[PDB]
Amino acid sequence: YEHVTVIPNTVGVPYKTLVNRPGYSPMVLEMELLSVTLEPTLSLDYITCEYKTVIPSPYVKCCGTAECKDKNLPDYSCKVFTGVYPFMWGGAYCFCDAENTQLSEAHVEKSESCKTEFASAYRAHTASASAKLRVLYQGNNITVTAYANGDHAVTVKDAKFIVGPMSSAWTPFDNKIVVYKGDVYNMDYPPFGAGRPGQFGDIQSRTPESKDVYANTQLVLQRPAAGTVHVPYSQAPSGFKYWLKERGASLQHTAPFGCQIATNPVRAVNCAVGNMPISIDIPEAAFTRVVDAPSLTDMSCEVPACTHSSDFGGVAIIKYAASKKGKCAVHSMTNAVTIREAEIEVEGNSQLQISFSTALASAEFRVQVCSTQVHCAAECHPPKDHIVNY
Amino acid sequence: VYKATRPYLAHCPDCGEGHSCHSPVALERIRNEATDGTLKIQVSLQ
């Protein structure tokens, strides 16, 4: 028998489902989906980190004019300064008074820190939804791990489970994302070879092992001081260092629906988004016939204690007169109230105690023990909250 | 490796009281990538 139901996509909330196979005693199944993971497919565009300014010894051409050649290097800067007369500890470096030139050279590469301190630019597309669950099946807890696509059958204790498809295809990760250690950011990052100086992407490396890097850092070489051998320069400060302080709060703090964000791999956890359909093909052996199950008669219900809250604040005592000894399923016929226990051991001319949860001050509900219903009248009082820490 | 290399004199903008000199303790590069606050300082001497 195939039982089809729909539960909201919320982890840590046990849901009760009534399985009613015609000519067979009702079956109560408790279903709870712990974690819900939304892992998007990533495509690495580039890596960014703090840049490094490689400045070799300046070419001081004594009595001659140096020539700048166009070098294919990131942020390559070359400038030949005329009328230079530099000094060292033991006097002038050049024989000539005039006609001495200094060739200043500079280029930008990845810093030594790039393997340790870096941000990754990813293209996020089509999030794969996965769930961890728990089913109270035949008085025992069974764990079913399946893809929430509606086309992945997982069989546990002869019961076939088909989870999904997810009502929401949402994945907390726009098309373009940026990852730094344990933090994920939704950012429309500049493409490779389009990074601006002093901003995220001033230096771009396709992979962290890449040899040739892109660089656009506002490197401008300045004229050296009179009689001084040095390479003065003006440069836009590190875009990665600037982003580290300007990034703001990560997705773990800003994402709606109380999403928890994790890395390695990047995923949205507990993104309570939408609902989840559940299909359970329960085998014939699990079911017990109405004749084989005890018959409930002369039923009465009393509520000695009730508090309307999120947890099971209500207590109900149900008196009965059972035809034989056996297991009976307990289920609330009113959607306003939910019962904690799914199965109770029935005896004879005895009584049973149940725990229930409701939000109503005046709770009117029907309890189905096996195949017979009993009306419960409850006057539930407000809780202290206040505030609770779960 | 120090049999091939040697300490040197290089330009320093302030050798004391804001005056420039050919320093035997000239500063080359100060690295501050360490998040623990440790500074890796490069000097002209050995």
SS (H, E, C) chain A: CEEEEEEECCCCCCEEEEECCCCECCEEEEECCCCEEEEEEEEEEEEECCEEEECCCCEEECCCCCCCCCCCCCCCEEEEECCCCCEECCEECCCCCCCCEEEEEEEEEECHHHHCCCEEEEEEEEEEEEEECCEEECCEEECCEEECCCCCEEEECCEEEEECCCCCCCCCCCCEEEEECCEEEECCCCCCCCCCCCCCCCEEECCCCCCCCEECCCEEECCCCCCCCCCCEEECCCHHHHHHHHCCCCHHHHCCCCCEEECCCCEEECCCCCEEEEEEECCHHHCCECCCCCCEEEEEEEEEECECCCCCCEEEEEEEEECCCEEEEEEECCCCEEECCCEEEECCCCEEEEEEEECCCEEEEEEEECCEEEEEEEECECCCCCCCCC
DSSP state for residue B21 in the 8-state scheme:
E
| Three-class SS state of B38 | coil
**Under a CB-based contact definition with an 8 Å cutoff, are residues A109 and A71 in contact?**
no
Question: What are the residues whose beta carbons fall under 8 Å from the beta carbon of A165, sequence distance 6 or more?
Answer: A148, A149, A150, A277
Interstrand relation of A91-92 and A135-137 (parallel, antiparallel or unpaired): unpaired
Task: Say if CB A160 and CB A280 are below 8 A apart.
Answer: yes
- Contact (CB, 8 A) for A50 and A114: yes
Contacts of A326 (CB under 8 A, 6+ apart): A288, A293, A294, A345, A346
Distance between CA atoms of A22 and A200, rounded to whole angstroms?
A: 65
A229:B11 CB<8 A: yes
Across the interface, of A89, A113, A230, the residue whose CB is closest to B33 is A113
- Note every long-range contact of A216-219, with CB atoms under 8 Å and residues 24 or more positions apart, other chains counting: A216/A74, A216/A75, A217/A51, A217/A53, A217/A75, A217/A108, A219/A53, A219/A75, A219/A77, A219/A106, A219/A108
Q: Which method resolved this structure?
A: cryo-EM
Nearest CA in chain B to A225: B13
Distance CA A218, CA A235 (A): 5
What Å resolution does this PDB entry report? Answer: 9.0
CA–CA min distance A88, chain B (Å): 7
- Retrieve residue B44's tokens: 């002209």
Paired sense of beta strands A176-180 and A183-186, if any = antiparallel
Chain A interface, best mutation among B11, B14, B39, by max A CB count within 10 A: B11
CB contact under 8 A, B9 and A89: yes
On chain A, the residues whose CB falls within 8 A of the CB of B22 are 88-89
Name every chain A residue with its beta carbon within 8 A of the beta carbon of B35: 117
Q: Please compute, for residue A54, the number of CA atoms within 13 A of its CA located in the half-sphere on the CB side.
A: 11
Rounded Cα–Cα distance for residues A107 and A270 (Å): 47
Say if residue A232 is preceded by a cis peptide, omega within 30 of 0: no
Of the candidates A20, A340, A6, A280, which has an alpha carbon nearest to the alpha carbon of residue A144? A280
Cβ <8 Å between A50 and B33: yes
C-alpha A172/C-alpha A261 separation (Å) is 9
Q: Of A203, A59, A177, whose CA–CA distance to A124 is shortest?
A: A177
Across the strands, what pairs with A280? A3, A161
Distance in Å, alpha carbon of A113 to nearest chain B alpha carbon: 6
Two structure tokens written together for A228 = 């001084």
In eight-state DSSP terms, residue B36 is: T
Residue in the structure block whose two tokens are 């546990």: A156
Contact B33 A88 (CB under 8 A): no
How crowded is the C-beta side of A380, counted as CA atoms within 13 Å?
28
Backbone angles phi, psi at A137, to 5 degrees: -120, 115
- B12: which 2 tokens? 């320093």
- Chain-chain contact of A116 with B11 (C-beta, under 8 angstroms): no
B11 vs A230: CB contact, 8 Å cut-off?
A: yes
Count of other CB atoms within 10 angstroms of residue A167: 14
Chain B positions contacting chain A at CB under 8 Å are 9, 11, 20, 22, 31, 33, 35
